Design a protein around this ligand. Structure first.
Ligand SMILES: Nc1nc2c(ncn2[C@@H]2O[C@H](COP(=O)(O)OP(=O)(O)OP(=O)(O)O)[C@@H](O)[C@H]2O)c(=O)[nH]1
Ligand SMILES: Nc1ncnc2c1ncn2[C@@H]1O[C@H](COP(=O)(O)OP(=O)(O)CP(=O)(O)O)[C@@H](O)[C@H]1O
Ligand SMILES: COc1cc(OC)c(-c2coc3c4c(ccc3c2=O)OC(C)(C)C=C4)cc1OC
Ligand SMILES: Nc1nc2c(ncn2[C@@H]2O[C@H](COP(=O)(O)OP(=O)(O)O)[C@@H](O)[C@H]2O)c(=O)[nH]1
Ligand SMILES: [Ca+2]
Ligand SMILES: [Ca+2]
Ligand SMILES: [Ca+2]
Ligand SMILES: [Ca+2]
Ligand SMILES: [Mg+2]
Ligand SMILES: [Mg+2]
Ligand SMILES: [Mg+2]
Lengths: 426, 62, 438, 350
């Protein structure tokens, strides 16, 4: 039994976290009271990766819910699957973090972090063989970003030989709460570079463009963005949740050739709006999945090169046709795969589809084009930082300009490290 | 083609056909390799924990 | 009678081992129960099948087998399967988290913690042996257990059983049924460390088996099950002489003597025919001449390569079924006049032949049709070095960038081992070429 | 669409094949070391045949036959003819030749014939050559043996000594010597295609049996005439007489045709050589497929007998025929395998 411990931090972290638990609960047949009512036992062979078993044939998510504010967690307990969650795993302050990384990481969040770690310990102790952790959070606020990355540092200290992966929502001015997000994101990214094994980069800019341009939603809401996030989260975790022999470490080994370059581009096909009679064809799943339009990180894959790629196809389909179409798409895009990692494109098929689609495919791309995302953040960061604009919110919590200068430099080293491998040849 | 050493039994037979003639590491040493690598892990792990302790000290100072 | 102990390491090793022991039981008439009606020496014997099976006072025939994996899900299927009664708990050994396709993790980190236990469960079987011959070790090149733990086991077996022969059945990595990227690293690392410890190794390239299953069994997307049943057939034909009456390859030492004049060049090529779909409604059975001629087509080899562009050091033919020496020699004569078969100058040009009258046994409901006669050719040809060249080139491409190297360093290994292992392989490729080319 | 890779910089022929394939709009070129190619235009030396045919879902094709060097290297061609029953010890169309090492050697049989010739008072000039003799170097036409046997040992390459064809056919006007270059394409099905256009590689100087050590009289390669000879280019451009002129000449001057007089036995020799090695090099059942373009070099003696003198494994073409022939490679060797959206070749059936 290779259990995963899930942590959701802050507003974005808990909203997308709750959708995730809603979506996979339905996939495993667990109802809002934790009672199993499914029709296949494929649903229960790996149920324990994400769920604990409690007497009474109940299944309880191995999930810890964290915020510095109670608001968004009252709404979780309200929401459709709110009762599923273990009540002692709600860990909440009252102050809120004011979209301030310094409050989440250094002052308000430091006050609360030990309480969170007590619940993490008490979930890990009950794990036959802990596989690792996943965190859902945004990088643009204060709690998920600042206190989320503090948690990751503490978790590493206590579990240094355990996998730490994240679903990290990147800020965009197109979907923006405050002007200081580039500061919060830049500080968080350096933490992630050091202390996560895999970070799935969920770019709110891509989720907006997708909703606005392809789904023709003229006023996208957080709900529309999260419909895409939840589809992708169900997707990437499909092969951890159903039979097919790789734990998180084995996936990291074959996806991450250099330790700092572990920021992945997600993607999904078919792109859908909430509320699909035509099943897509294996050729259609494949080409959409590689097209910039389905990329949930606003990066152009044709502007860089793929170091590794993974794709998970869901539904009853031809593995022969999957192999053929995958090997196809690699030849019209053959220049965009590094030639010094042989066979760096890998595929899985799972015959259980997601709710509401008979054919679907999830994309996991480790592309050097991701540097466009970090350049974009870095440019917004510098635009304000060259005038020290809005810094007083941070110096007022004990931070120094130097920590911002280091975060900036660390960020630009990451961009240069990507550019190194995009020009590397055989 | 010369046939030779034809042996037979109830289960089968065997023979050779010629078409032309012709023209330590110690137990201790392993245990040492395994232990030097374990030490290298412990040293890498100790640097990480020292790094994290420096981070904790910075958090205190902030 | 001298006993053989089979050791299965990692996923590939365990699941191939189960397919083999399944087939062995069908060949010797042993039931999943472990009962062998036809063994009239109850509770004992020194018959040829006793080389692979021990006997209980209750007449249970127990494989001389140890299964070892660093995570438990594969061996659990053994403990619940159709032959669950065959084995005894102490023969099945499972860690708790696996090597994650990381040689260093299987060799150094996790391996250090389970090596002593494995050698104890092996000692328990070696203590049931009057005359232990040595070991048959099944594993993948690509897995972190199959590569990393196997090389550690092989080192320690040379220490604890220094006079004993050790044979490998090794699965060479193929992208078509692998989702890993670092397998070239693990393959070269385990080959370097295992080379001076293995007397004779039979490589099976999953690419070749996969294609055979597609082309000759009409299986559009072969599974591990499809592959392993074909592999088990080939393995059985290789070990049949250890388990049946005969005069060829009757002990492990004779494998090296007959197939390996040079210790380093100890990787014989296997070629098998015929592979016939069981869904074939009508099939015309193939003659001794046709199956023997098929042994020189690359499409039937366990490793795709071109023996015409190399030289032979030895060649055995192992027939099962309706075969007599006359037809074999008539086929060899005809084949020699129409194929490029070059032996090295310092070796006799010729074939050692073994025939066993029982036709190949096939698993009921499997994919392979019963046939009236089949052959497995074991040839030590330098052409198999093509597989080393392929794998070393993939290694070079990744290591020039140190891609993925941090995973191995992180588990206690030094970059120096990468280059040390790759230099060994460079020497091996040269060894093959000065033997096989002018 | 199809991909291909280019790994011989210096190949006139496949340079033009590269251009042709791109200009179809259905072939994409990759870089030297990208392995997901459909087609490899490989290097001449140590082409990695072992790495081909192992890319899942890619049909792969290379422009060289592994093992074809047995035919296209002078020492090994001698060994192949004498040891292959298909060809035999006294094959009628290859000059009596001997492989000789400097410093399986034949130095004694070489002299046994040479001696019986001495006493016979019959023609006993010989030539000694190597595969390392580029642009006209390393050859020695001598009527006395040990004058060439010492020329052999003064360098470290293995040489062949062959009976020099003393009585060659001589064109007129010019009393001038030549050899014939035929281009042969062998596709993946091992069909043998003879390019209908050959070329004669002429001597500008008149032949002169008297002094052998003067050579542009005796040595017909395009370069040596281009550089060493005073009369280079009188009768035809570049010392290159093509088949139409040579045929019209053989009728006017000898009352026969090129076909009957020479080509019948050129076609016979090409088939004999290539069918002999087919079992050793055929890719019909292999995981990659091969094709190759060969250049066969022939001599004609004054009785209109054709002799084989070498087979070239990496030949160039005549400027006049590149377009035609290179387009023939695409159509027969490449699009046969990778199809797109009359004929210039003579199929030698077997
Ligand atoms: N023929 C065959 N090959 C297999 C089988 N299982 C895995 N493989 C191959 O083995 C390679 C992966 O190594 P594994 O043996 O699965 O891993 P392992 O030995 O358990 O070591 P770990 O990394 O700890 O899991 C891949 O290249 C697979 O193609 C099998 O059942 N049959
Ligand atoms: N047996 C023989 N009798 C008469 N002349 C001969 C001969 N062997 C060779 N020659 C002459 O010597 C010349 C060079 O011989 P050869 O053809 O082997 O050189 P080469 O290999 O450099 C030609 P290429 O450049 O096309 O490969 C020929 O053009 C021919 O005129
Ligand atoms: C923290 O969030 C995570 C994010 C992830 O990917 C974005 C993955 C993640 C899943 O499936 C994979 C697959 C894969 C390779 C990598 C992954 C991977 O890495 O190859 C095949 C063999 C085709 C199967 C799927 C896990 C996470 O831990 C919970
Ligand atoms: N995709 C998505 N992004 C969010 C959501 N909520 C906030 N964000 C983004 O995340 C940033 C702030 O994080 P937020 O979760 O609001 O504050 P936190 O509670 O401190 O993490 C802002 O730039 C928002 O654009 C959400 O529900 N979905
Ligand atoms: Ca307070
Ligand atoms: Ca505490
Ligand atoms: Ca008995
Ligand atoms: Ca030994
Ligand atoms: Mg908010
Ligand atoms: Mg495993
Ligand atoms: Mg030449």
């Amino acid at each position: 039994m290779r259990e995963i411990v899930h942590i959701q931090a802050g507003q974005c972290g808990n909203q997308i976290g709750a959708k995730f638990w809603e979506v996979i609960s339905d996939e495993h047949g667990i109802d809002p009271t934790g009672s199993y009512h499914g029709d296949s036992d494929l649903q229960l062979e790996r149920i324990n990766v994400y769920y604990n078993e409690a007497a009474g044939n109940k299944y309880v998510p191995r999930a810890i819910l964290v915020d510095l504010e109670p608001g968004t967690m009252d709404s979780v307990r309200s929401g459709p699957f709110g009762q599923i969650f273990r009540p002692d795993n709600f860990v909440f302050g009252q102050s809120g973090a004011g979209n301030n990384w310094a409050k989440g990481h250094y002052t308000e969040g430091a006050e609360l972090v030990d309480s969170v770690l007590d619940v993490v310990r008490k979930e890990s102790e009950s794990c036959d063989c802990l596989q690792g952790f996943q965190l859902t959070h945004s990088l643009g606020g204060g709690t998920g970003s600042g206190m989320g990355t503090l948690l990751i540092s503490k978790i590493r200290e206590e579990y240094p030989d355990r996998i730490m992966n994240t679903f990290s929502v990147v800020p965009s001015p197109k979907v923006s709460d405050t002007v200081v997000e580039p500061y919060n994101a830049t500080l968080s990214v350096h933490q992630l570079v050091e202390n996560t094994d895999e970070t799935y980069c969920i770019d709110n800019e891509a989720l907006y463009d997708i909703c606005f341009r392809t789904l023709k939603l003229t006023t996208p809401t957080y709900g529309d963005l999260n419909h895409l996030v939840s589809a992708t989260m169900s997707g990437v975790t499909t092969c951890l949740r159903f039979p097919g022999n790789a734990d998180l470490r084995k996936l990291a080994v074959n996806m991450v050739p250099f330790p700092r370059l572990h920021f992945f581009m997600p993607g999904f096909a078919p792109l859908t709006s909430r509320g699909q009679y035509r099943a897509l064809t294996v050729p259609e799943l494949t080409q959409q999945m590689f097209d910039a339009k389905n990329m949930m990180a606003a990066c152009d894959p044709r502007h860089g090169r793929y170091l590794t790629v993974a794709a998970v196809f869901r539904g009853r389909m031809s593995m022969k046709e999957v192999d053929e179409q995958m090997l196809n798409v690699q030849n019209k895009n053959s220049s965009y795969f590094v030639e010094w990692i042989p066979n760096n494109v890998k595929t899985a098929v799972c015959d259980i589809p997601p709710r509401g689609l008979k054919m679907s495919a999830t994309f996991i791309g480790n592309s050097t084009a991701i540097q466009e995302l970090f350049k974009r953040i870095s440019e917004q960061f510098t635009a304000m930082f060259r005038r020290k604009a809005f810094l007083h919110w941070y110096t007022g919590e004990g931070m120094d300009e130097m920590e911002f200068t280091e975060a900036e430099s660390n960020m630009n080293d990451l961009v240069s490290e990507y550019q190194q491998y995009q020009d590397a040849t055989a | 083609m010369e046939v030779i050493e034809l042996n037979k039994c109830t289960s089968g037979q065997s023979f050779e056909v010629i078409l032309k003639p012709p023209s330590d590491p110690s137990l201790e040493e392993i245990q040492k390799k395994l232990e030097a690598a374990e030490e290298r892990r412990k040293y890498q792990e100790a640097e990480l924990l020292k790094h994290l302790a420096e981070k904790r000290e910075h958090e205190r100072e902030v | 009678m001298r006993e053989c102990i089979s050791i299965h390491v990692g996923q590939a090793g365990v699941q191939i081992g189960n397919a083999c022991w399944e087939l062995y039981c069908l060949e010797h008439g042993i039931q999943p129960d472990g009962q062998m009606p036809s063994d009239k020496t109850i509770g004992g014997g020194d018959d040829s099948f006793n080389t692979f099976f021990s006997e209980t006072g209750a007449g249970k025939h127990v494989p001389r087998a140890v299964f070892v994996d660093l995570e438990p899900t594969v061996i659990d299927e053994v403990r619940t399967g159709t032959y669950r009664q065959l084995f005894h708990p102490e023969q099945l050994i499972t860690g708790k988290e696996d090597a994650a396709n990381n040689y260093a993790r299987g060799h150094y980190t996790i391996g250090k913690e389970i090596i002593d236990l494995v050698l104890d469960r092996i000692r328990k079987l070696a203590d049931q042996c009057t005359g232990l011959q040595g070991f048959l070790v099944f594993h993948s090149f690509g897995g972190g257990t199959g590569s990393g733990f196997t090389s550690l086991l092989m080192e320690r077996l040379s220490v604890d059983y220094g006079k004993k022969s050790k044979l490998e059945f090794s699965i060479y990595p193929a992208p078509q049924v692998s989702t890993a990227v670092v397998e070239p690293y693990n393959s070269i690392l385990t080959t370097h460390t295992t080379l001076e410890h293995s007397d004779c190794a039979f490589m099976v390239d999953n690419e070749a088996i996969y294609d055979i299953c597609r082309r000759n069994l009409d299986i559009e997307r072969p599974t591990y099950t499809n592959l392993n049943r074909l592999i088990s057939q080939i393995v059985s034909s290789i070990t049949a002489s250890l388990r049946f009456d005969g005069a060829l390859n009757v002990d492990l030492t004779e494998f090296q003597t007959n197939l390996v004049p040079y210790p380093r060049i100890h990787f014989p090529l296997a070629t098998y025919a015929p592979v016939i779909s069981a869904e074939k409604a009508y099939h015309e059975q193939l003659s001794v001449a046709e199956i023997t001629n098929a042994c020189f087509e690359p499409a039937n080899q366990m490793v795709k390569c071109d023996p015409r562009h190399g030289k032979y050091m030895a060649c055995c033919l192992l027939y099962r079924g309706d075969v007599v020496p006359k037809d074999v020699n008539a086929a060899i004569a005809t084949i020699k006049t129409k194929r490029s078969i070059q032996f090295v100058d310092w070796c006799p040009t010729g074939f050692k032949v073994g025939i066993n009258y029982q036709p190949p046994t096939v698993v009921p409901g499997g994919d392979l049709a019963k046939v009236q006669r089949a052959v497995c050719m074991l040839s030590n040809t330098t052409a198999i070095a093509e597989a080393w060249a392929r794998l070393d080139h993939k290694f070079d491409l990744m290591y020039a960038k140190r891609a993925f190297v941090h995973w191995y360093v992180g588990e206690g290994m030094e970059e120096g081992e990468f280059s040390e292992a790759r230099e060994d392989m460079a020497a091996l490729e040269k060894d093959y070429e000065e033997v096989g080319v002018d | 669409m199809y991909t291909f890779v280019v790994r011989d910089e210096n190949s006139s022929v496949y340079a033009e094949v590269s251009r042709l394939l791109l200009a179809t709009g259905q072939w994409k070129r990759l870089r030297k070391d990208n392995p997901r190619f459909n087609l490899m235009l490989g290097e001449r030396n140590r082409l990695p045949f072992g790495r081909l045919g192992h890319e899942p879902g890619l049909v792969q094709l290379v422009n060289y036959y592994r093992g074809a060097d047995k035919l296209c290297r002078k020492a090994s061609l001698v060994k192949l003819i004498k040891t292959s029953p298909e060809l035999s010890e006294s094959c009628t169309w290859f000059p009596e030749s001997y492989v000789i090492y400097p410093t399986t050697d034949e130095r004694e049989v070489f002299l046994a014939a040479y001696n019986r010739r001495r006493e016979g008072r019959e023609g006993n000039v010989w030539i000694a050559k190597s595969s390392a003799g580029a642009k006209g170097e390393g050859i020695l036409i001598s009527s006395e043996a040990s004058e060439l046997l010492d020329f052999i040992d003064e360098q470290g390459q293995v040489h062949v000594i062959q009976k020099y064809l003393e009585k060659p056919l001589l064109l007129e006007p010019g009393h001038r010597k030549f050899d014939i270059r035929s281009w042969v394409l062998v596709d993946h099905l091992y069909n043998i295609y003879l390019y209908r256009e050959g070329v004669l590689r002429t001597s500008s100087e008149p032949y002169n049996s008297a002094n052998f050590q003067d050579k542009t009289c005796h040595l017909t390669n395009h370069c040596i005439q281009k550089e060493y000879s005073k009369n280079y280019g009188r009768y035809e451009e570049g010392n290159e007489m093509f088949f139409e002129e040579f045929n019209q000449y053989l009728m006017d001057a000898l009352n026969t045709t090129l076909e009957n007089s020479i080509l019948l036995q050129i076609k016979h020799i090409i088939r004999s050589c290539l069918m002999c090695i087919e079992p050793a090099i055929s890719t019909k059942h292999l995981h990659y497929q091969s094709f190759q373009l060969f250049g066969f070099d022939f001599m004609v003696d004054e009785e209109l007998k054709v002799w084989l003198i070498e087979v070239n494994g990496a030949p160039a073409c005549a400027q006049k025929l590149y377009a035609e022939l290179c387009q023939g490679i695409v159509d027969v060797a490449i699009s046969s395998v990778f199809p797109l959206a009359t004929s210039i070749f003579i199929k030698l059936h077997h």
